[PDB]
């Protein structure tokens, strides 16, 4: 049925060129026109161009001309987006669509351009202290520093802490990211661990936070 099969994600090195496929179903691309859309991180939506298969037409955005070459294998119902000599700015999500406006957007393929290698994260427990004379609040955290590529998975006590929990965005510190995770617990005495998971490097680390 009307479906737009993308990829989800791809890590291209810088300078390189990458083609992204987009398998269609429920309709024949041949009798339609695939669109390609660029969504940059934390930014807005922006059109690339669209291959009008049937009439052979395919018009771009002057602001994309050489970089993107939009093609389309009629006998695979896949439409294509070629990305040429990639840079940072080419790092964003690439949508498949049929934006006469229709709704029909694929899943998206996040493309990360980066000369970095899949590096294992570094987990440090932010233990606190500050015991008055019973007079206290309680909150702690974890620090997943430097690893590649995204994403990573922080959980506390394997899913007993959630509310009172927080998990801010992995900021980039030169090809590596760093993610903070905060958990407020009422005053107790026993274990508040931070399980960390990174599928890439095939890593999993459960950092118990013992007081300092």
């Amino acid at each position: 049925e009307v479906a737009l099969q993308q990829s989800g994600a791809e890590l291209v090195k810088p300078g390189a060129s990458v083609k992204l496929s987009c398998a269609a179903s429920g309709f024949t691309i041949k009798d339609a026109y695939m669109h390609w859309v660029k969504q940059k991180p934390e930014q807005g939506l922006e059109w690339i161009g669209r291959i009008d298969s049937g009439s052979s037409n395919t018009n771009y955005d002057p602001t994309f001309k050489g970089k993107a070459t939009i093609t389309a294998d009629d006998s695979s119902n896949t439409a294509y987006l070629q990305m040429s000599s990639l840079t940072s700015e080419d790092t964003a999500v690439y949508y498949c669509a049929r934006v006469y406006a229709m709704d029909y957007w694929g899943q998206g393929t996040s493309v990360t351009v980066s000369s970095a290698k899949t590096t294992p994260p570094s987990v440090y427990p932010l233990a606190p202290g500050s015991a008055a004379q019973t007079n206290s609040m309680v909150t702690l955290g974890c620090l997943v520093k430097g690893y590649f590529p995204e994403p990573v998975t922080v959980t506390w006590n394997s899913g007993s802490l959630s509310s009172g929990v927080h998990t801010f965005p992995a900021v980039l510190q030169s090809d590596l990211y760093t993610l903070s995770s905060s958990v407020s617990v009422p005053t107790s005495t026993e274990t508040v661990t931070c399980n960390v998971a990174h599928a890439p490097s095939s890593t999993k680390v459960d950092k118990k936070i013992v007081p300092r």
């Binding site: 059109w47 949508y95 934006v99 406006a101 694929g106 998206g108 909150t139 905060s182």
Partner: protein, 220 residues
């Protein structure tokens, strides 16, 4: 090209009220033929693709709630969500589907009005391990506050260190319509050890003075 202009980037919305977003354009999107304005209306959410709410300026799409209404004529159009819900908290873009190339606008985001909350600031000295790795980050959690605005300030021994600070902000919360943030000023072991005090100086709307959360390399 046709420039889609839609303000503000964000609009503070109260639950159950009637919000009205606006869009405007350079060329007219009116199609003297069909006589209908070639303007779509999308909504986007963190981790989703856009969703088509209205087309032809005011024609609802199969599944958009009746509480969503299109309007506008010429260059000036609006998205009125009357009876605003929590699922309606998302970004709203207006696109041109009139001419090529296809231009969307920038978006207006809805943030649910909670009531001012003072950040619950906490600072953490580097971990044992953080230091074997020749480095030392000092994390501060400015959790749970309202409104979104607040400026932190780092400083070793009384003097502001505006360097090595990563601030990971956080999109409004669902349950409490609250904000958090994570500023961490990373240093080298010997940078961290050639000093004593470290402070997290949060300036926010609630208090009529700065929030202090200093730690001192040597306390225990």
């Amino acid at each position: 090209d046709i420039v889609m202009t839609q303000s503000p980037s964000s609009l503070t919305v109260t639950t159950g009220e009637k919000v009205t977003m606006t869009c405007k354009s350079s060329q007219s999107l009116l199609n003297s033929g069909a006589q209908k304005n070639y303007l779509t209306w999308y909504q986007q959410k963190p981790g989703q693709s856009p969703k088509l709410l209205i087309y032809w300026a005011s024609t609802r799409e199969s599944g958009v709630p009746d509480r969503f209404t299109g309007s506008g004529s010429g260059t000036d159009f609006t998205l009125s969500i009357s009876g605003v819900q929590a699922e309606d908290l998302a970004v709203y873009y207006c696109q041109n589907n009139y001419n090529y190339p296809l231009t969307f606008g920038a978006g207006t985001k809805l943030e649910l009005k909670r009531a001012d909350a003072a950040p619950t600031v906490s600072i953490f000295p580097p971990s044992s391990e953080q230091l074997t790795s020749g480095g030392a980050s000092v994390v501060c959690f400015l959790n749970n506050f309202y409104p979104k605005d607040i400026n932190v300030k780092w400083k070793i021994d009384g003097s502001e260190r505006q360097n090595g600070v990563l601030n990971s902000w956080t999109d409004q919360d669902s349950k409490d319509s609250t904000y958090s943030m994570s500023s961490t000023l990373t240093l080298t072991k010997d940078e961290y050890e050639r000093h004593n005090s470290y402070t997290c100086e949060a300036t926010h709307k609630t208090s009529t003075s700065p929030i202090v959360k200093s730690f001192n390399r040597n306390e225990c």
